[PDB]
Amino acid sequence: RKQVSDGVAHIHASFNNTIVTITDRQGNALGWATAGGSGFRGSRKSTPFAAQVAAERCADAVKEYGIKNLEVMVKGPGPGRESTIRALNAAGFRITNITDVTPIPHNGCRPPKKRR
């Protein structure tokens, strides 16, 4: 309910999965969906079509909460940066702003020396 009439979409696209979470500007959330949360566990869950169909399920089940326009917040590289707002304007609802809020430490904590 509550007729919020404005929203915030956090997205986090990893190298193997994408998550989408819906909230207000104030941080309390409504609903969320993952690329894992549409089936196909494993390799195929990191795909942009999976990301947009996860957005299809994500816009579902938050429908009755009264949302028209929203802002976009983007974390992590991959396919989720590019195949989510296509599903969102397939839903048609207008985008206020798109923000890349990918966390960048200024070469702070030491990463692994991985990938041999």
Partner: protein, 135 residues
């Protein structure tokens, strides 16, 4: 063809109904070069199905081709070639007596189109609209 394009050297159409598609079909159902014992079974099965459908002749299998047409694996030439191949190799498995009648029962179940032809179609057609990632 690492190098060349097709020219698709053509053939002669059907004698009676004049369909180049039916000529390609009797080329399909042909084994060891027998158009005559192909076409006797073909025209006998088609003249059974015309009575058993109560409709025209060419639309009676235009329906039976469109409803067994898949999407991908794709180009329409391979679509309407694999469709006829599917009907033949579907009727090959049936436990009936003769080839024309097992083809007729296959086309009947492809008329009330939950037949073994669309059963064979809807595995690759099931991968379609379920694995739409690859490009």
């Amino acid at each position: 063809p690492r190098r060349r394009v097709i020219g698709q050297r053509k053939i002669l159409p059907d004698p009676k109904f004049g369909s180049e598609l039916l000529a390609k079909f009797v080329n399909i159902l042909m084994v060891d070069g027998k158009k005559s014992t192909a076409e006797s079974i073909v025209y006998s099965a088609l003249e059974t199905l015309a009575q058993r459908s109560g409709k025209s002749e060419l639309e009676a299998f235009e329906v039976a081709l469109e409803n067994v047409r898949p999407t991908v694996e794709v180009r329409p030439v391979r679509r309407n070639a694999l469709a006829m191949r599917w009907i033949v190799e579907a009727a090959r498995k049936r436990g009936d007596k003769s080839m024309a009648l097992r083809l007729a029962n296959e086309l009947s179940d492809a008329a009330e189109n939950k037949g073994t032809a669309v059963k064979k179609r809807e595995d690759v057609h099931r991968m379609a609209e379920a694995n739409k990632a690859f490009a």
